[model samples]
Target: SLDQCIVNACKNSWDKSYLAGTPNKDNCSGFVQSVAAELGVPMPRGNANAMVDGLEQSWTKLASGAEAAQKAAQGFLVIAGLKGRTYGHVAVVISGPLYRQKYPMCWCGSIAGAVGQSQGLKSVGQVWNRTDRDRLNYYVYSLASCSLPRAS
Candidate 1:
């Protein structure tokens, strides 16, 4: 599934570039849309803003508490950055032990943008640790467990 998503996104990028005659925001939107399509998820409209909204909604439904929200937020922080509202990348949360420090590796981006298990999304003031849960921008919407879909 991961390989398929990568292939689809790459193909979409190539196709968009060919059609638009440039690799710009439209190409990025096409890439993300391709991945979302393959995953059987609805592709958000309006480019990056829609993607950010989708991410927030997805996590809001999955998170179970302050800690869970922080986990998801940190995941987003790593991919989307802390300050700037750019949705140029995506990441899947591969399973890890509850609140465990180690997270299974997932695709980030090209070599220059590669983010590993140890390196998380960091901002000027944001921290990935659970201790910084309260500092997150969104409120914690508690759930019984984190049951969001995982990419096969």
Candidate 2:
């Protein structure tokens, strides 16, 4: 149900850019939070900093690459970016063994400021319309019991 809610958010967000609900409207954190709201998850406000400052309590950060994918559930949140950046990017994880063992797909909003999906743990180079701005270290996180899922 949570995943479907995300899909619905994405379906209508082709034109949705980063920081959609804010004045500047160019931040990835706001973009993710807006989507989370659609599913009734009370995420922290502001950029990636706010998301991790508290929302992270609801998640456990994991290593990148195969190790990250192996530790992820069917659907989880992937949050990462330049460690030095004030804010970071957010993504949804969809993992299964198909083309390669333990590889997963990620749906994210790029800095080109568009919604797109990618195969594997990292999505920058795996699909059409990718930009270097969207490149960030792939850090995975597992959903904990605190972040309640909304009714579908």
lDDT agreement with native, every candidate: 0.33, 0.45
Q: What TM-score does each of the candidates earn?
A: 0.36, 0.51
Which pairs clash (backbone N, Cα, C closer than 3 Å) in model 2?
none
User: Residues 1-152, candidate 1, lDDT per residue (tens digit)?
Assistant: 22333333434443343224543223334444544454454544545445556656653433232333344433321123111244333332222233334222222222122221122132212223344322333312232222334778
Taking every candidate in turn, the Cα RMSD to the unseen true structure, in Å, is: 9.1, 6.3
Candidate 1 residue pairs that clash? 78-121
Give the top-scoring candidate (TM-score): 2
